[PDB]
């Protein structure tokens, strides 16, 4: 409902075509996260 | 962001970045032209406090 | 200042091209010098029409190639570029030449 | 993606290299007589990508059977300007500098590292002292700070083989001749 | 004897940093102890050039040089000229003077400013040059003419179809 | 005209573009007053080793449709004949009658 | 190049601009909803793909807008209303308008 764009165009289909369901996706925002402490000296990562 | 009047209001960081390439450019141009050890000195703290 | 040089073979063409240009030049920029018409070059040509001989037999055919300067007085940074994306009909070779 | 750990770590000047696409060079924002950004300062195009999607600064690329192909004029990739939101760019600093979260965090990281207070390395990074790096055979130590007469009475009697610098490159000289596996065994 | 030192002004006011400097010796009267101040000289506009205008020619980045001696009297003075930050040295108690041993070959390279220099440079069609004056300042474009005999690149500013196409120096225009 | 001497023809063309620049520099030589004797007669006897076909005053203007050698004309690279053809079927861009 | 408060405006019909005068700003006293048009404002578009048409009409009538993009002031969604009092401010040298 607030953040990740790809997951909301896919909900707004979803819930047009009565299929309530949800593909989750991650928040943009901590990418943001990740681009604001990567930006410093530090390197933050993702494993796996 | 635009404030709708012809003028950026800009953020902050872009402010900072600036001072950080306007003092590195300085730096570069100062140690290739020979400036004495006193002045790059200073320029050198100058970038370290920016 | 921005000489043009209009060449074409067909001259109402040619006139319809010189109007454009003009048209393009006065929005942006001001005081455009004019469409001054220079002699039309009349190439002409004669050539014997018997596939092999009468030699009085003849042809006499012609290429009239038309050329229109116009002037720009004052180029603007709005208006030279403007002709970039302003291209000109087929079959007339336009040349801009700034001073 | 799928992924069950966040990694943090120090970043080496390779990483920051492999992370950038381009090099920030000026620090010039916006045009202003249009809004199309100036190469190549803090807001680019050729370094950070396209401000249209798929509409190439120069434009030359509009087809939908012709993707993947970059332009040439403006060699701007004619792709998503989502791609703005991710991409990086480096600064090449043209000399060493201290970064503040592990000078002055208290403690102190480099502090407690090279075992040496904080207000000599403050005195050193600020470029208003000497420290010593490769002391040689003479009378100075290796962590030893000097000043400017002591600085003169080291230049006069020894300006030869001793050595000693100041500012970051003397604590980058510190920290990369420091051994670990000595001081592991010594402490 | 008189040595050198090195001073700081908000940069951009320098020129009357300079003027003021003169000012307050010539006020507080003492003539033997300050010999000259050196400001904004080496100019080169951008690239090359043999006539006059032009102009925007800079070096001193914000750095006032000063023939001087040591009183603490002279550096009150100095200090108290306005718009002056301080010196720059190893220490505020006895600033630092710069050196000599490089002014030798300073001095040889100030005789050379202008006897038999200016290098050669070259260029190529690739990818646009830049214009910044005249009516198509702020537009770019492409090289297709380069003569190298009356020094002046053919450029047409890089547009689709036949726009314009025109001549500019190289000064006249950025690569 | 035949097949063959279109043929000739470009092969002579073909000559006359490879051995250009050599051609020149022996001529230009020949010419050259302030130049050695012994220099000069080298470079008269070098042009006579070159190939016949190589000089640009052996090839004959042929019309580009049909070869034929006669009734050239320069501005059209066609014979006569077939240009008056063009003319009328408005192939010719410009050309038209001329009456004054 | 600069704005047009006009009426000429696309996109719009009867229904919209019944309510505005001749010259774009709404009449002193029509009530109004919440969600119509009080000043119709339409900003330059261009011609990029300026074909056969588009290029007569950018020689027909001497303007180069031409379609614009509509930027028209909007009653917020939401209020009623009743316009009582309108007022219009002209920079020095801007032709004024027959409502100015």
Redesign the interface.
Known sequence: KSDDVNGRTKMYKNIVDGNHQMEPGMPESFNVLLKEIRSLGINIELED | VPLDGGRFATSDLNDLYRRVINRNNRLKRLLDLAAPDIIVRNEKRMLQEA | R?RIRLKA??HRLIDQAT??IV?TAK?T?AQVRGPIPLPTR????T???S?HVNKDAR???????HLRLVDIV????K???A??????AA?VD?????? | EEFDAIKIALASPDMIRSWSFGEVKKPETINY?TFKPERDGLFCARIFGPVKDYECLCGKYKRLKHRGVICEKCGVEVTQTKVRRERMGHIELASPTAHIWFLKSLPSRIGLLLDMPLRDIERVLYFESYVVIEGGMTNLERQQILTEEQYLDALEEFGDEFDAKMGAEAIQALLKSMDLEQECEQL | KKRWYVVQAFSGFEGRVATSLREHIKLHNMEDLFGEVMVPTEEVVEIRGGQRRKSERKFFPGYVLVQMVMNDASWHLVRSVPRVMGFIGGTSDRPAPISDKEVDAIMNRLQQVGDKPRPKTLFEPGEMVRVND??????NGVVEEVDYEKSRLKV??S?????????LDFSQVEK | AKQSMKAREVKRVALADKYFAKRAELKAIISDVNASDEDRWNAVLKLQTLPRDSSPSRQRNRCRQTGRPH?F?R?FGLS??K??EA?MRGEI???????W | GPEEITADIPNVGEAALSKLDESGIVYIGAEVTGGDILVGKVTPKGETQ?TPEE?LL??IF?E?ASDVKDSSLRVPNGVSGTVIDVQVFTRDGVEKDKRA
């Open positions: 921005i073979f067909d109007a454009e048209e929005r920029g009349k190439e002409r040509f050539v014997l029409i596939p042809d006499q055919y012609e290429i009239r190639t004052e180029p603007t940074e208006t030279v570029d002709l970039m994306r302003l291209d000109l079959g336009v040349q801009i030449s700034l001073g | 007589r | 005249g009516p198509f300042a702020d537009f047409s500013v547009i689709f179809g036949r726009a314009t196409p025109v001549e | 009734g004309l501005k006569r004949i240009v008056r003319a861009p410009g050309l038209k009658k001329a009456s | 300026l290029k950018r020689a001497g180069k």
